[PDB]
Paper text:
The SARS-CoV-2 spike glycoprotein is the major surface antigen of the virus. Its function is to bind the host receptor ACE2 and mediate the subsequent membrane fusion required for cell entry. Here we have examined the structures and receptor-binding properties of spikes of the B.1.1.7 variant first described in Kent, United Kingdom (now termed Alpha)10,16–19 and the B.1.351 variant first described in South Africa (now termed Beta). Recently emerging variants of SARS-CoV-2 have acquired other substitutions in the spike including a number located at the monomer-monomer interfaces, at the receptor-binding site, and near the furin-cleavage site.
Author numbering:
A (entry chain D): 20 to 133, 141 to 613
B (entry chain A): 323 to 555, 574 to 590
Write the structure that this text describes.
């Protein structure tokens, strides 16, 4: 029977792939820890072997019929293995597409404004200089260089990707991206492709009032910052958001301080005074995860992984990552110093690790999160729990008494909203525009006009000077020019709060949800572990059912999280005007 | 009245040191069996060596075996994964117990497994140890298969070449010093005590005393206990004199 043929084939593959993947991951880790010569050729050889093996296995698996298999897990593994990808196109077209991607990445990497590069001077210049003219000049120069240089390349990329995706029985490349949130074969849990185009605009219409009030409050604060520069009814400029693309508004925290009398909670000096050796941070995070009820760390974790920078003589990457090399090897690569940010990043990375240890029993092809969003929410909720005053008081670094005055809560919630709720409209607008461009409903002649009118409508941001058709603003962003999906952040931002509310309710915590704690609640740990262990063997709808009891994403917990801030904003904005007008322009 | 103990006179130390401290252990798929007879067996240091990750004795208590006799002992030894040691026990299934080594239900021995991550594992992978993955039928208890014919899964005969739907059965273990506990090498030794109607050979270590006649006394001959009057001639054969003695209930 073909069923047993597929089972035997997967049985052989699992072992072969496990071995080759361990070799490749070990070589990559040895390069990242030791970036010297003779470590690059090894990485390239290992990656080439792994890619050739994957392609040959795909060709071999292409022979077996797919619809015949019916075990719903062997079928999943075979379907995951059968992905032609770029092999459908001719060799010359594939080479040209690879060249286009490489040259776009190179152009993005190498950009000069005059000398002045992107990192780190330009971002730091925009962060704190707070001068209208020079910030406008830098923004306009960067746009008029990058967008000018990548227009025809982007058009050719669009058409090539669209035809390639149409070659694989999909509708468009946007549909190929949307196909990640696909489940079939399980009645009562099916999720169609087109349902993701909904549940995003529909859910965004629920969160409109909070974003509107936050936008009005930030507008008023900017009016305070720049008196005779912004109309009371006009929209915000693009170069006053405090960031290059306006993806995050956190840089505007200094201007939009709710109450400057009460400072924020900072315990860095507490860790400095007690001389935390940068190893006890990980011990404390491990103790937290044990108190929740999750398994202890592997013995080899404490010896194989690196936490302190190797030194001045040897240079290594300090980008924090959590490596799962397979065969029972889990490591963490992160340069740690004494700071609250390092504490929260350590908690997030150990959350990643504890997720990885949960589904190690699954076969090789099913060792991933249920969808592309479940892996970051689990990491973020640990930081959310460990940032509360309760857990900070549990350890001795924070003073046992404190003040817990409401101003502190308002300030913390405002600062958190400037980052969490100020990025949903931008991500939604960008993804919607890219979907409509790939679908072809938006012709070539109306790219920039559509982009800027959508910016005026949804995000409420107006460009400083008009741009002709030759400009290309979306291509300036990192993810756009590097061929990455950008819808993951929007869904993660909601799954995070869904999980937090479910865990807090299961822990019978009373009071506001923004000051909830999960430590010393073994029932919450068990409920979370019952979903972590699942892996990718179940539809993400049923996996979501095991935590919150719902089969779809919802924005209500997110609105309840900012409830004190919502009331304070209502009271503060009852006088000032609410809304934006697209007619007004800076020029 | 009195108690007499009689065991055969053997002064040959049992060669457990050669099997346990062997330089190289055989692969799991093709293991090596060592036969042991005519020795005095000291199961004390074996149990309390304080360096064994698992010492499970089936059939008989692990401590009483210091004063019992069997016909002979079979010792098997090999190397497996840390997580597969569980399958070396009666009534277990998997990919080891099906195709490599299946113990029978009436097992009357011991299983001793200890970690060997220092010797077998090396940087880059130690591909010397192999295990059998595919086989047409499950193994019968205590059976060895060494053939390496290409296992056929599809209908078309591949004629002994590695064609489509045909697979090389033996797959190589990989070992590295940085693996996890569930993937590091473990050396396993299985002791089977087999006894027949033939006189016992492996015994000890226990002292012996002189034989008595009449004078109803408790006794244990060759590990079997009794009470009564021994008369020269239900009955036992002397393990050092070869004379039949009759037992009468006093
Ligand atoms: C990094 O690689 C070089 C290349 O030979 C080697 O000499 C050096 O010892 C490596 N670093 C460490 C910390 O082992
Ligand atoms: C195949 O079906 C069996 C029987 O229901 C099930 O236990 C197993 O999880 C399924 N998947 C695989 C990969 O064996
Ligand atoms: C890959 O291409 C082959 C070429 O015939 C086709 O049979 C197969 O269905 C394709 N698979 C996918 C997943 O597109
Ligand atoms: C905090 O509570 C006091 C007492 O009710 C009140 O006067 C003050 O306005 C509150 N501050 C905020 C920011 O809500
Ligand atoms: C949880 O219980 C432990 C007792 O082992 C205690 O030390 C710790 O402070 C408790 N956590 C909190 C947040 O109170
Ligand atoms: C094996 O070698 C060790 C170390 O030399 C020794 O202590 C032991 O007596 C030897 N024999 C056995 C059966 O362990
Ligand atoms: C051991 O016992 C046998 C019994 O047949 C005897 O012949 C032999 O002399 C004994 N060995 C001694 C006493 O050293
Ligand atoms: Zn992360």
């Amino acid at each position: 029977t073909i069923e047993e043929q597929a089972k035997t084939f997967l049985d052989k593959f699992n072992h072969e792939a496990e071995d080759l993947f361990y070799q490749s991951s070990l070589a990559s880790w040895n390069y990242n820890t030791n970036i010297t010569e003779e470590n690059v050729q090894n990485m390239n050889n290992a990656g080439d072997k792994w890619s050739a093996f994957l392609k040959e296995q795909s060709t071999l698996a292409q022979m077996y019929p797919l619809q015949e298999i019916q075990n719903l897990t062997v079928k999943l593994q075979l379907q995951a293995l059968q992905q032609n990808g770029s092999s459908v196109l001719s060799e010359d077209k594939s080479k040209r597409l690879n060249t286009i991607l490489n040259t776009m990445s190179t152009i993005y990497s190498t950009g000069k404004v005059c000398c002045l590069l992107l990192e780190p001077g330009l971002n730091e210049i925009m962060a704190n200089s707070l001068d209208y003219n020079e910030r406008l000049w830098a923004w306009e120069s960067w746009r008029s260089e990058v967008g000018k240089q990548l227009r025809p390349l982007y058009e050719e990329y669009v058409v090539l990707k669209n035809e390639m995706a149409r070659a694989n029985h999909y509708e468009d490349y946007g549909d190929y991206w949307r196909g990640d949130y696909e489940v079939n074969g399980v009645d009562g849990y099916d999720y169609s492709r087109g349902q993701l185009i909904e549940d995003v605009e529909h859910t965004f219409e629920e969160i409109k009032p909070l974003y509107e009030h936050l936008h009005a409050y930030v507008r008023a604060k900017l009016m305070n910052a720049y008196p005779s520069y912004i109309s009371p009814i006009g929209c915000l400029p693009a170069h006053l958001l405090g960031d290059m693309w306006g993806r995050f508004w956190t840089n505007l925290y200094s201007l939009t301080v709710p109450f400057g009398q009460k400072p924020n909670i900072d315990v860095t000096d507490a860790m400095v005074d007690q001389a935390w050796d940068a190893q006890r941070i990980f011990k404390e995070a491990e103790k937290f995860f044990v108190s929740v009820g999750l398994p202890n760390m592997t013995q080899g974790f404490w010896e194989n992984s690196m936490l302190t920078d190797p030194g001045n003589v040897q240079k290594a990457v300090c980008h924090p990552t959590a490596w799962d090399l397979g065969k029972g090897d889990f490591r963490i690569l992160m340069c740690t110093k004494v700071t609250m940010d390092d504490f929260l990043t350590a908690h997030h990375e150990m959350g990643h690790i504890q997720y990885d240890m949960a589904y190690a029993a699954q076969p090789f092809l099913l060792r991933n999160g249920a969808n592309e969003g479940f892996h970051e929410a689990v990491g973020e909720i640990m930081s959310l729990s460990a940032a509360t005053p309760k857990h900070l008081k549990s350890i001795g670094l924070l003073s046992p008494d404190f003040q817990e005055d409401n101003e502190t809560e308002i300030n913390f919630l405002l600062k958190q909203a400037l980052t969490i709720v100020g990025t949903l409209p931008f991500t939604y607008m960008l993804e919607k525009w890219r979907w409509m461009v790939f679908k072809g409903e938006i012709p070539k002649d109306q790219w920039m006009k559509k982009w800027w009118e959508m910016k005026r409508e949804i995000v409420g941001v107006v460009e400083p000077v008009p741009h002709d058709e030759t400009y290309c603003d979306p291509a300036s962003l990192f993810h756009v020019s590097n061929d990455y999906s950008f819808i993951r952040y929007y869904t993660r931002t909601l799954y995070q709060f869904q999980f937090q509310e479910a865990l807090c309710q299961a822990a019978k915590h009373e009071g506001p949800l923004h000051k909830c704690d999960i430590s010393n609640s073994t029932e919450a740990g068990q409920k979370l572990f019952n979903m972590l262990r699942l892996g990718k063997s179940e539809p993400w709808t049923l996996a979501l059912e095991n935590v919150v009891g719902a089969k779809n994403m919802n924005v209500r917990p997110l609105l309840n999280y900012f409830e004190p801030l919502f009331t304070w904003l209502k009271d503060q904005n009852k006088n000032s005007f609410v809304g934006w007008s697209t007619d007004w322009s800076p020029y | 009245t009195e108690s007499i103990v009689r065991f055969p006179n053997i002064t040959n130390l049992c060669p457990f040191g050669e099997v346990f401290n062997a330089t190289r252990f055989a692969s799991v798929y093709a293991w090596n069996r060592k036969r042991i007879s005519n020795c005095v067996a000291d199961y004390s240091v074996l149990y309390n060596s304080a360096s064994f990750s698992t010492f499970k004795c089936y059939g008989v208590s692990p401590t009483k075996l210091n004063d019992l006799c069997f016909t002979n002992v079979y010792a098997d030894s090999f190397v497996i994964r840390g997580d597969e040691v569980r399958q070396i026990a009666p009534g277990q299934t998997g990919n080891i117990a099906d195709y490599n080594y299946k113990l029978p239900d009436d097992f009357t021995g011991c299983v001793i497994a200890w970690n060997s991550n220092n010797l077998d594992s090396k940087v880059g992978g130690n591909y010397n140890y192999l295990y059998r993955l595919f086989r047409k039928s499950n193994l019968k208890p205590f059976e060895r298969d060494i053939s390496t014919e290409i296992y056929q899964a599809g209908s078309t005969p591949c004629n002994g070449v590695k064609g489509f739907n045909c697979y090389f059965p033996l797959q190589s273990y990989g070992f590295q010093p940085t693996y996890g506990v569930g993937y590091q090498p473990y050396r396993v030794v299985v002791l089977s005590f087999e006894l027949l109607h033939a006189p016992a050979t492996v015994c000890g270590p226990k002292k012996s005393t002189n034989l008595v006649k009449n004078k109803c006394v408790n006794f244990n001959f060759n590990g079997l206990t009794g009470t009564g009057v021994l008369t020269e001639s239900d009955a036992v054969r002397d393990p050092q004199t070869l004379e039949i003695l009759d037992i009468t209930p006093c």
